[PDB]
Structures are given as C-alpha cells and as structure tokens.
Design a protein around this ligand. Structure first.
Ligand SMILES: Cn1ccnc1C(=O)c1ccc(NC(=O)C[C@@H](C(=O)O)c2ccc(C(F)(F)F)cc2)cc1
Ligand SMILES: [Cl-]
Ligand SMILES: [Cl-]
Ligand SMILES: [Cl-]
Ligand SMILES: [Cl-]
Lengths: 316, 331, 330, 315
C-alpha cells in the first residue's frame, strides 16, 4: 500500500467520470427472513431496482444472504446489492419494504426501524408487510409523519390473489381472468365482495344469487374460508409462507416503481367511508410513483359493509 | 341442477399433455430456489415437485400455487410418487444430503449415491426422453452415477458443474474492474469443488487478454494477488454456509440459466459436468466441467479449451481427485 | 482440420423436430409487427416467415437475424416455399389485401378468400396439428373460411377478432378514469369492424358496475357521452390509416397476446372469432368474437355473456351482417 | 363531462423518473420505440418529429396496445415541451448524408438540450460517427453524455455470422468491430474467441488474405449488410432497433456493460484531433463512464488511423 502499484484495471480501462451519481430506482427491504428474501428475489428477477439494499439486525445471516444474491449477479439486471445493520445503506430509496418483526412486541420494533428509514429515505414510499399489516401500516404512518399516500400496507393483495386462484380452480380459468376482491382486515375477518366476482364481466352472483350464502349448494363460502385458512395451512406444512407473499409484494413494487396506476387491495386509512369514523384496512387503491394516489368507492351490500364495519371494529 | 360453471362456460374440449414440463426433485432451499427462478423466467407450462418429505412438499407447492396470479406457469403439482413427473422435458435433481459447515461436497458421496439409486430409475421410468440436470453434490460424480443408472446418452445427462463457480469468478472480476459480470469473461473448469481450475489464459474484457496485459496474472508473483479471486470462488460455498447455513439463490439462478438454454435450444456455451475421457490425456471415465453447447438435446457439443501446462495439469489433477472416489463406490 | 473442428467436439449429429415453432404468413406491416412482438416475448424457439414477395421476405428475415444477439429465438427461417413452416405449433396468417383509407374491412372478402384458398392448404400440409390464428381482414369471415378449407376442428381455428377492439376500448377507459387499462375491464364483441358491440353491462373497475352508478352509460341520453368511446374504437383503425397509412403495432401486440395464451396453455379469456352457433338463438355457422378460453388446443371453452335485450339485439345484427356475406361464398 | 369518475374514484392528490424520447418516427425511430416499450425501460415514452400526421398516427397505434405494455404514458408532438425531464434522448431523425443531416441537427440538438439538460444523448442518425461530434459541439454536454450507436450493431452482426459458421449462439460468440460505423470499420481478429479460446491462435491466418477459410468475408458481410437489406426490403429497422434498445438498457439501468459505441478517441491509437468513432465503452446512468484500451496490432491500429483521418476530414 505504501508503494505505487500499476494495476491491471489501469492498463485496461481509461476513466472519464468518478461519481456514484446517487441511485435512481433503489429499493430497500427491511428484514431478511423468508418473507424478506422472497420479496428480494422476486424484485430482482423482475428488473425493478437498479440497487437493492438489505437491512436486518442478524448480521451473520444478513451478510450471507447478500453474498448469495451477489454471486448470482451474472443472471440478474440489478447491478448493486448492498447490506448492513446501519440504515445508511438505505439512503435515496424510492421504495422501502418492511418485513421485520416476530402486536406491542412488534410495534416497539417499528419505533427503532421507521425513524432510521425516514432519516436516510425521506421521499420514499413505505410498503408495510409486517403483520398485522392493517395496524402496523397505521403505526409507521404515525412514527414517520409521512403523508398517508406514501404509507402503503400490503394488506389483502395476497388474500385476493389466493381468492382468484381458487376461483380459477373451480371454473377452469386462469386467475388473471377470475376477478374478485377480498377487502377489510388481512386476517380472519376479511370481507369477500361477492357482488364483484365475475368472468369477462359476467357477475356470478347474478347467475347464482345464493353465491356466498349458507344455502349455496356449491358452498362458494368455503372459498373465502380457504383464503383465511391459507396461511395457517401452509405454515403448518412448511413452517411459514414466503413465495406467495413475495410475488404479491413485487407486483405492488412494480406498480409503484413504474407508476402504472393499477388497482390493488392494500391497507390505507378509511376514515369516513362506510360510516367508519376512527383505522387502517384494505380497499382498492390506485398505486403509482406517489403511492396510493386514489381510492375506489366500491358499492358494498349491507351484509358486505356490515362485515367491513365489523372488521374495522375488530381492528382497535 | 345446473352448476354455476355450466351457466357461465360452454365446453368444447373435454381433454387435458404438457409441452414444456419441468420437474424439480427435492424441495430444499436449493430445489425451491430453482423452482422460483424457473417459474419467474417462464420456462415451463407445468412444474412438478417431488420429494419424500411430504409435509414440506405440499406446503411449498401450495405457497407457489397461491402466487399463480403473478406467474405464467398455469400448472403446479407435487407428490411423493414419481408418476407426477411423467413426460418432463427437463428433470432437475436437487435432493440428497447437503454439506454442513466446513464439510466438503465429496463427503456426501456415500449418502447421495445411495439416494440416486432410487431416484434415477423412477425419473427415467416416466420421462425416458427428458434431459437430466443434476445439481445434488458432489455433482461431478453424481452426474456419472446418474448416467450409469439411467442408461441415457451422455448428452442428456448434464451436471450444473462450474456454471456457478464461473459466475462467481466473473462477479469478482467485475468488482475488481468495475465492470458488469456480463462483460467480464473468465472460466472456472473441472470439479465443482476445491480442485476447480481457473483458466487465466482465457480471461478478457472486450476480447483483450488479461494475462497478456499482466503476464503474472494468476501466479504467486502477482502483485495484485489475482490468485485470491479464485480462492474466494472455492471458499464461496463455505463462507455462505457459515453465514446463513446454506446456499440457495446463486445456485438457483445458475440452474435456471442452464434450464433456459436447454428449454429454448439456445446453444449457448456453459461449463457443465460431462465426461472428458480422452481430453487432456485423461483416460478414466470421469465427469467434470468443460464448456459445452447446451440445447434441447442437452450437451450436443464440447468446446476444447486451450490450456497451458499449469492449467492442463491442474485439470488432470482435478480429474484424478474425482476418479479416486468414483472407483471406490458400488453403483 | 477446420477451425470449427479444432474448436468444437461433436456429440450429436441428430436434429430434432422444432418443439415450439411459430409461423407468420405475410411479411407486411402487420405480419412483421406480430413477428417482432413474438420474438421479444420469447414465445417460440423457431420463427418461420412466408410470403410471395421473394425480395422483401429475405430482407425482413435478415433484419431480424442480425439482431439475434438481443433475442432468445435461435432460429429464424423464411421462404416462398411453405415447407419452411413444417411442424409449426401455431401459424399466424396475416397475408392478403389490407384495408385502404375509407374502405371497409368487408370489401376485402372476395380478394382474400381467393388468397386463403392458396395459403390454408399449404399450411395444413406441413403443419396438420397446428392452431390457425387468422388475422387477415375481415377476420371473422376469414376464420370461417380457414376452418372450412383446413378441415380442422373449430377449436384449432382462431381469429384475432375483437381482442384489439377490447384493448382499444380499455385504453380509452383508463384515459377517462385515470387508471391503467389493466384495471379497466370492458368487452367489445361481435364483428371486428363497424358492427362491433360494446358490452356496457359488463364495464367495471374493481368489480364495480359502471352502468349501475351511471344508468345512462352508453345511451343517447348519456351525460358523459360514453357511446363515443366505442365510436372511437370502431373508427380507430380508420383514423390510424389516414395518419400513417396502416395499422401495425397495436394488432401486433394483440396477436402476440393471443399467441402467449396458446403457446403457454394459460387458459386466459379472450374475445376471439369462433363459431357462436347456439348463442342468443343463432342457428347459423357464423363466426364472430365472444370471450373464449385460449389454451394449447386453441379455444377450449366459450363464455356465455349475459347481454341486455339491447346489447343482444346489436349482436344479432352484427351476426346477420356477417352471415349475409358468409353464405354467398364458394 | 366526468361525473362518473368522482362516483367511483375518491381522489387523494409529479414529473417522470424514467423518461425516454425518440426523435424521429421513421422505421428506425419506431423500431427503437417498440423495442424499448417491450423491454419496460421507460415509464414515459415521447415521440417527436415534424410531420404532424405520421407522428400522431404512430403515437395512436402504440397507445392502443397500452394494455399489453408497462409504459403508462406515451406522448408525442412537434414542440419539444413533450421531451421535458427526459433521462435519455434517442436521435434518429434525418435522411454521403452529411450536408443534409448536419443541417437538421443544427435545428434539433438545441431544442432537445433545452428541455432535457441532464439527459444522455444517443445519436443514431447516419453518419453516426460525425453526427455524434456534431451533437456534442452543438449540445455543449460533456462528451460522456453524447453517445453514438456506432458499431454496436456491426458487432451484433459480426457476432451471428460467427454463430452460423460455428454452430454457436451469438451470445457465446465474441468479436469486436471498431472504428467508423461504415465501410472502414476494423475487425479485431485478435479478440475473436469462443469461451476464451482465441480463434486467431487456433488459426493464425484468420481474417488475412492467406486465410484458407476466408474469414475476411465475415467482416465484408458486415460492411455490406446494410446495403443488402436496403436492396431487399428498402430499409433497416429491426436489428438497429434491438441494438439501440440494448444500449438504452445499460444506460437506463446503470449496468456498466461494455459496448462498441461512437465516442471521442482523442489521445488513443495516435489521434490528437476531435474525431468520434467506435471503441468498447462502459455504459451507465451517466453515459460513457470509461473506455477499454484494446491492444491493437500494427495493421489493426493502422486501419483505425485511416478510418479516423477521413472521418476527421469531414468533421
Ligand atoms: C430420496 N428421494 C427424494 C425424492 N424421492 C426420493 C426417493 O427415494 C423415492 C424413491 C422411490 C419412490 N417411488 C415412488 O414414488 C413410487 C410411485 C411411482 O413410481 O409413481 C408409486 C405410486 C403408486 C403406486 C401404486 F399404484 F401401487 F399405488 C406405486 C408406486 C419415491 C421416492
Ligand atoms: Cl459462465
Ligand atoms: Cl381484452
Ligand atoms: Cl459469456
Ligand atoms: Cl444503420
């Protein structure tokens, strides 16, 4: 180091600039558990970030994960993958995905996580994935001071995806052509909007008025029951759920990063709509570079809205 | 009573074979990494998962199915019975014993050779025309075992080999040179293990030989100590296993890279495990990585790399290290 | 020994039938738009181009081949002889006289019918198991034609139909509502032409009936004049021809969208041309667009859309228009 | 009117973060536009030209296929207020085409830099080597943000022909054509290889007159490629469209891949003038960040000085 050494790089490369240039489409993932890495690989293989930053308190695992993704750089189009306990690595993130945690036991963690994120990434959109996403989305919105539009919770984007996959299995149609929405709490009190289910615009409830009721001879209510028990079943089998939620988060990050303005059922403040006064639950929202820029005023039945009011009641 | 599906859909074809079916055997961290990477690259219209651990098998299958909306692979199945792998174009075998911290891949021979005695005959039974892509370790030896048990022609028995070692080597090249690995060209050949051989004479950027600009490239007298780049490649697996307990994402992307060239018949060059009896004066039925052309028929061609005395010797040494084990077994 | 032999050791002289081959018939602006879209979506391992123009055919092939470094389709063949189309899984037929400015797609019938009498039999000879994706106009009538000449079951003969008409309709929806066309759901059925039918009763966003919130949706007494959105869809092809002389990119993406569903057996729903005999009282062998489940066997199912008496009447009229032209053919 | 929208959408609330502009909507410009759209490189694409009809027709045709894309905003117009905040601007407008095209550049380059000051310039109009110098002088940008397509396609053609001869995908065939994007391009035979195996080492007569296999034809085909395609279909568009979109990917994503694009090579291979031509450069978000110093033989370096002297003459 004391002596001047002629480098192979100097013989080969002639330099013009010397600026990191600040990242343009950077994304950060807080938490490198199964869910965290699932979101990381899905984002990496969708070419959504020119720089990926991983952060978690377990530094031995954090480094191994980073090195594992870095070794596959040849097969990716994301030219920079960094990690580190210090949240300085997350500077200039356009989107921060939070999957860290094990409600109070996790709300404390948000106190130590959210400010660090907001410190180095003030203009970034928050995508809360940690459970209960309905409440922790309201938390990160209070601990951060960000405008509600830039505080998104994953919410029921996966519940609806599960709901449409089950629709397809019953109809022999790809879920892309099975339209249906699961709203409310991302949990046992989710609300299936039976009045919107359709294929090619044909309302199923109109064909089958018993749809979703107990008199339904086909028991389409079991479909929502499966959407609720899904995570319970996969967890009891493999110990956790990761692939499904990872693909869901990446599809949200796609709408946000690329500013597509697609409609997703993500958590957000619903003060006023449906008579609810108080805090955060999922509804169809347009998603773009500014996060939730709009809401869709879905016309719910009295029974549907009743459950939603019951879902918001359960939440706090 | 008419059902909702009949009120909605008028059927024409009451039928149901798949054209680009891929099977992943073993749903460990490696198998499931290959699965997700293949699913997200749209290489198959049907993905089959096979493993003995049924509880984890179904859970992984279900977890993948729930993301169907976000994928372009309309069918995902699983089961302990190999009949679910019928008519696969490509069978990726990842099941077996993986190395623990500090453990060498060659210490897995006895265990995985015994497992391959039960896997290969069943895969071959239901997919006699598929291409076998072996990932289980030690891959170089298990590729030879899979080729002996299967009875397939050597072109349809490929081992992932050094496709990842070379990817790691090119990544470390990119970090030193500040270039994307895609434009950093370097080959790690031989065993997918401690005896891998770096071909310094073939390293280049934009066709500029690096050993010509730096004649000490890869030697002990190298002031830049480029020999350490290959040391990291060899230690890579151990370093990551020591940090997170296993490897998954890098191998999964590498296997997906080979599957892409096989399924799409690209005829790209890859360093994959194949028999090299006759090349470089090697007279034993040994398998190891040389650059091969990969297509819908598997390994259709080998590229004969030009090696120096040191490089050719290190490759003959890597073969002797492997044959010393293949000849002690019973398969 | 040659340089190749000094460098490459061979193991397999045996070659295999192409596994995911697609053929595009016609190297016009429409055919080449389908070809470039299919290449950049990695739907095939072999692309074959066929046409009667020997010069333009070779030039288009070379122009694609020279960009092979940036594609994942390792074989691009072409030629006036249809033997280059052998073993195709999907044959996309775009050849034929195209719609000139002001002209109606229905004036091209007799010209392209004679052309299809030459194209279809040669295609069927070398790819008897393929799906036929008809794009030539009028696509609805020409789908019926290709089905009669080919002898295939009607599930393997598909017309691009109103897959583009519905895509154009959903783009205008998003423009008005400020939403991505993906999240704006609306269907245009019937003829791929002037007699198309907008299904207002199905229009929705996030499963919210728009006609329910706005009962006057699409009617003459409509405050927001939504019937114009459909009028734009009908006239879109005309306004595009007047500005650049033809339509290419949009149809190319729509056709590539259908090929994806077919080649990958996705079983998505698409509004494509097929026999609707048995729907809405129709008893004739008339072809037009309704939502169909597309897979590796082509059209496996049809969706029975619940239409209003006004929408259904429009569809009947559209069918009568095409049936009046179909029965007068040899 | 728009009363239904407020019945359905409850509002809560920007400039583009990944905008790209393609000046000129001819066969090349549209081939570049379509290639960029189907690679999801831009969140906004802007088409600009002078013929108001064709400009709108192309915009509409692309807009109709928006459902099949992920580019949520496609705009066009004659005024360059559409190209504002562009991170990359591809210049294809134009028609021995020096006098005609240099005139057009004097009119376009000023307007582009106005609304897009921090953008990178990707010059595709021919002669690309000279017009990259022209665009650089008129723009005032630092030479790292003025890129010419150059021999990126020439190398993409040189590769392929290699593939056909060897039975290998061009991805695994490596060869570099440098110099002027034209008849004076220089093929670096010393760098041709498959999997690091120098073809020149296995076959010393490679590319020379004594070549028994006549590999010099491969480069001849590359030089004649554009002529032969124009002679058959009347123009080239697809290959150059895919080539430009490849450069766009490295720039828009800051990949730092090596491409043989046209840039100033003052101080290399014996050149003190301000001449632009093709060498392997590393492309990223800031354009050409570095150059690769390819070791050229005595004959290779000779051709480059002549290909540079003539080019500089016009310049
Ligand atoms: C280590 N490992 C990882 C993954 N798999 C392994 C194994 O060792 C392994 C080794 C052998 C198997 N055999 C089968 O699956 C048998 C199966 C089939 O062949 O279909 C079958 C199904 C139904 C019947 C019937 F009709 F009689 F009921 C008979 C046979 C499975 C796993
Ligand atoms: Cl490699
Ligand atoms: Cl549609
Ligand atoms: Cl390579
Ligand atoms: Cl050109």
């Amino acid at each position: 180091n004391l002596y001047f050494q002629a480098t192979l790089k100097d013989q080969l490369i002639y330099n013009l600039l010397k600026e990191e240039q600040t990242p343009q489409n950077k994304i950060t993932v807080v938490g490198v558990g199964a869910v965290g890495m699932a979101c990381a690989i899905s984002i990496l293989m969708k070419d959504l970030a020119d720089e990926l930053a991983l952060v978690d308190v377990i530094e031995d695992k954090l480094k191994g994960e980073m090195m594992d993704l870095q070794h596959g750089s040849l097969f990716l189009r994301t030219p920079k993958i960094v990690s580190g306990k210090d949240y300085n690595v997350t500077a200039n993130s356009k989107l921060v995905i939070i999957t860290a945690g094990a409600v109070q036991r996790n709300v404390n963690i948000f106190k130590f996580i959210i400010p660090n994120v907001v410190k180095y990434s003030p203009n970034c959109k928050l995508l809360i994935v940690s459970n209960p996403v309905d409440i922790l989305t309201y938390v990160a919105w209070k601990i951060s001071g960000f405008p509600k539009n830039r505080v998104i919770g994953s919410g029921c984007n996966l519940d609806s995806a599960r709901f449409r996959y089950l629709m397809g299995e019953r109809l022999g149609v790809h879920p892309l052509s099975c339209h249906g929405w699961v709203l409310g709490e991302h949990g046992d009190s989710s609300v299936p909007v039976w009045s919107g289910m359709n294929v090619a615009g044909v309302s199923l409830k109109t064909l089958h008025p018993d749809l979703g009721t107990d008199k339904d001879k086909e028991q389409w209510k079991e479909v929502h029951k499966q959407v609720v028990e899904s995570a319970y079943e996969v967890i009891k089998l493999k110990g956790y759920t990761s692939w499904a939620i990872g693909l869901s988060v990446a599809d949200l990050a796609e709408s946000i990063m690329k500013n597509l303005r697609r409609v997703h059922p993500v958590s957000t403040m619903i003060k006023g709509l449906y008579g609810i006064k108080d805090v955060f639950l999922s509804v169809p929202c347009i998603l773009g570079q500014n996060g939730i820029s709009d809401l869709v005023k879905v016309t719910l039945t009295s029974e549907e809205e009743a459950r939603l009011k019951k879902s918001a009641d359960t939440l706090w």
